[PDB]
Amino acid sequence: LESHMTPKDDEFYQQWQLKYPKLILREASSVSEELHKEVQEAFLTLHKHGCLFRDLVRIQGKDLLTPVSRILIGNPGCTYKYLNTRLFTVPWPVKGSNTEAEIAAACETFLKLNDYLQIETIQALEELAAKEDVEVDIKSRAAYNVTLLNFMDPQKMPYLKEEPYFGMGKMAVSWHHDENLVDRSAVAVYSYSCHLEGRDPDIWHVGFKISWDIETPGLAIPLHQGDCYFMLDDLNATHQHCVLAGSQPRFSSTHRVAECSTGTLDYILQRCQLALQNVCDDVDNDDVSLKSFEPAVLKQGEEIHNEVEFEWLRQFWFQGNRYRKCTDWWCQPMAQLEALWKKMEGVTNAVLHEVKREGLPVEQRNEILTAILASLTARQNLRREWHARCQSRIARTLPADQKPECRPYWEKDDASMPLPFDLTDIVSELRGQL
Ligand SMILES: O=C(Nc1cc(Cl)c(O)cc1O)C1(c2ccccc2)CCC1
Ligand SMILES: O=C(O)CCC(=O)C(=O)O
Ligand SMILES: [Cl-]
Ligand SMILES: [Cl-]
Ligand SMILES: [Cl-]
Ligand SMILES: [Cl-]
Ligand SMILES: [Cl-]
Ligand SMILES: [Cl-]
Ligand SMILES: [Cl-]
Ligand SMILES: [Cl-]
Ligand SMILES: [Cl-]
Ligand SMILES: [Fe+2]
């Protein structure tokens, strides 16, 4: 028989205390009724403005539309990958300064909730540490830089997946870990919902289990309006969690310390400047001359080229639906990244030209090809993948306002670009020689 534990079961409590001590529940009553109202109306305002979107993600070769709609709010310039989709932050008013009045206010509210949750988390880590620069690690692991807001109306689904192991019933989100977070970083969630036998089907729960293990009955924790739960230290890594759907719609705010060593605007702009150091930079024109044709430098250049194109430009524009409707903060940055990428397209063309030059020893010519082939290979492959995703039946189903864009994209007819979109010819020709 497939079973789970709820607050009804006598054993729920010892299981929580003994097996899940890094799981904290702070009930609505513990949070000011003031913060509750401001946060809940912020949810409603974001919702009314149509700021939350479902995503057309890709999982194990599968194009799938997320039942849950979401928006990422957080530090200016920061990003967070979710299901292989790079979500771009709608900035909250962290010091420094930058949106439609109401949206800006709501972001300020979620920054406010962030401060609160952060302090609460530090509190819990300290009490957890006091159970047996360690303070640096504590603050470090509670320094939420992003929140992912989610919404689902279960009524809008024709059928929900059954929780497969413990008889927990309908799942809004199946068993997983929160990914791409700083090591051992906490996660804080603010949940906003509106005879027995097991967990109450009409009430939203968060479910927990130990990874690899379906022997130990999972925990189903009820989440009433305004309840908050925290995953501390290594809990998110050692355990899986799911969201069990109730009967009414529900929002949540999920504060995280996103790992961002390669996920900020500042970072990717620096990468671009690094690549462009191999380019004579007197004037911005169609004439691109390179300072060096050394293999190591050309390799790095084409890799950065790939990074900006696929991890940034493609990711952003595929999000057909989004920020022109919540921010436009990434407007200018994305125009700038594309112009940077544009110059790099000229860089590739200069390399290809040098590979052609009549007076170049086959030695140096092979060192160049052996250096850049792996990059131009991925460029071709990734370009096919991304083009297909924009044309999937699933994609052409979406309304006009959403439907993914394949930027940047151009036809041969176009002579503002130096190289073709399809490189298979150029790529094969390079391999043949080598
Ligand atoms: O959430 C998803 N699918 C889904 C889940 C539940 Cl729980 C449900 O009740 C109904 C659903 O359509 C996606 C998914 C997420 C991760 C891996 C595989 C698929 C499909 C796009 C997100
Ligand atoms: O909503 C929660 O309680 C956790 C976050 C979640 O399920 C999600 O990633 O959509
Ligand atoms: Cl634990
Ligand atoms: Cl609603
Ligand atoms: Cl920034
Ligand atoms: Cl600890
Ligand atoms: Cl912060
Ligand atoms: Cl609601
Ligand atoms: Cl694991
Ligand atoms: Cl993990
Ligand atoms: Cl430039
Ligand atoms: Fe989740």
Instruction: Check residue 96 and report its DSSP letter.
Output: S
Q: Do the beta carbons of residue 28 and residue 240 sit within 8 Å?
A: no
Q: Cα separations (Å) of 361 from 357, 364, 429? A: 9, 6, 18
Tokens of 160: 């929900």
CB of 394 sitting under 6 A from ligand 1: no
CB atoms within 5 A of ion ligand 6 belong to 129
Q: Do the beta carbons of residue 283 and residue 315 sit within 8 Å?
A: no
User: Is the residue at 215 inside a domain?
Assistant: yes
Q: Ligand 1: which of 53, 66, 81 to mutate, judged by most atoms within 8 Å of the beta carbon?
A: 66
d(CA 96, CA 155): 42
CB atoms within 5 A of ion ligand 12 belong to 173
Q: Do the beta carbons of residue 93 and residue 109 sit within 8 Å?
A: no
Tokens of 365: 């010519």
Q: Do the beta carbons of residue 208 and residue 201 sit within 8 Å?
A: no
> Counting atoms of ligand 2 from 1, which one is nearest the CA of 82?
9
> Counting atoms of ligand 2 from 1, which one is nearest the CA of 191?
3
How many Cα atoms sit within 13 Å of 370 on the Cβ side? 8
Range of the domain at 341: 265-398
Residue type, 178: D
d(CA 334, CA 22): 40
Q: Map tokens 């079961």 to a residue.
A: 9
Centre of ligand 8 to C-alpha 252, Å, is 10
Centre of ligand 9 to C-alpha 241, Å, is 12
Residues 291 and 343 in one domain: yes
Residues 102 and 208 in one domain: yes
Count how many residues are written for the chain.
434
CB of 174 sitting under 6 A from ligand 1: yes
d(CA 381, CA 391): 16
Residues 270 and 153 in one domain: no
Centre of ligand 11 to C-alpha 302, Å, is 16
Q: Cα separations (Å) of 139 from 119, 121, 142? A: 9, 9, 5
Q: Which of 234, 264, 294 is the last residue of a domain?
A: 264
Centre of ligand 10 to C-alpha 47, Å, is 30
Tokens of 392: 């999937």
Q: In this structure, which residue's CA is closest to atom 5 in ligand 2? A: 254
> Counting atoms of ligand 1 from 1, which one is nearest the CA of 171?
7
Residues 252 and 279 in one domain: no
Residues 101 and 240 in one domain: yes
Residue-wise DSSP of 87-146: EEPEEP--SS---TTHHHHHHHHHHHHHHHHHHHHHHHHHHHHTT--HHHHHHHHH---E
Q: Which residues are 264's β-sheet partners?
A: 78
d(CA 98, CA 121): 28
User: Is the residue at 417 inside a domain?
Assistant: no
103 closest CA partner among 329, 321, 327: 327
Question: What is the maximum alpha-carbon separation in the chain?
Answer: 88
42 closest CA partner among 118, 152, 149: 149
Ligand 2 is surrounded, with C-beta below 6 A, by 68, 150, 173, 189, 191, 206, 243, 252, 254
What b/e sequence results for 249-260 when a residue is b if at least 16 CB atoms lie within 10 Å of its CB, and e otherwise?
Answer: bbbbbbbbbbbb
Residue 408 preceded by cis peptide, ω within 30? yes
- Method underlying the structure: X-ray
Number of domains present in the structure of the chain: 2
Residue 188 main-chain phi, psi, to 5 deg:
-125, 130
Centre of ligand 12 to C-alpha 148, Å, is 10
> Counting atoms of ligand 2 from 1, which one is nearest the CA of 252?
1
Q: In this structure, which residue's CA is closest to atom 8 in ligand 2? A: 150
User: Is the residue at 312 inside a domain?
Assistant: yes
CA 174 to chain centre: 17
Tokens of 36: 């509750």
Q: What sign has the CA pseudo-torsion 148, 154, 158, 164?
A: positive
Residues 273 and 177 in one domain: no
CB of 57 sitting under 6 A from ligand 1: yes
Residue 266 main-chain phi, psi, to 5 deg:
-60, -45
Tokens of 321: 């639906």
Tokens of 246: 């109730």
d(CA 325, CA 340): 25
Give the 3-state secondary structure percentages of the chain, helix then strand then coil, rounded to 5: 40, 20, 40
Residues 138 and 240 in one domain: yes
Centre of ligand 7 to C-alpha 173, Å, is 27
Give me the resolution in angstroms, 1 decimal: 2.1
The Cβ of residue 87 has, within 10 Å, a number of other Cβ atoms equal to 25
User: Is the residue at 349 inside a domain?
Assistant: yes
Residues 244 and 340 in one domain: no
- CATH number (domain holding residue 201): 2.60.120.590
- Residues within the annotated binding site for Fe cation? 176, 178, 241
- Residues within the annotated binding site? 70, 82, 150, 176-179, 229, 241, 250-252, 254, 256
Q: Do the beta carbons of residue 198 and residue 3 sit within 8 Å?
A: yes
Residue-wise DSSP of 273-325: HHHHTTB--S--SS---BS---HHHHHHHHHHHHIIIIIIIIHHHH--SSSTT
Residues 314 and 328 in one domain: yes
Residues 258 and 344 in one domain: no
CB of 54 sitting under 6 A from ligand 1: no
Q: Map tokens 């995280």 to a residue.
A: 256
User: Is the residue at 430 inside a domain?
Assistant: no
Q: Do the beta carbons of residue 298 and residue 279 sit within 8 Å?
A: no
- Residues within the annotated binding site for 2-oxoglutarate? 150, 229, 250-252, 254, 256
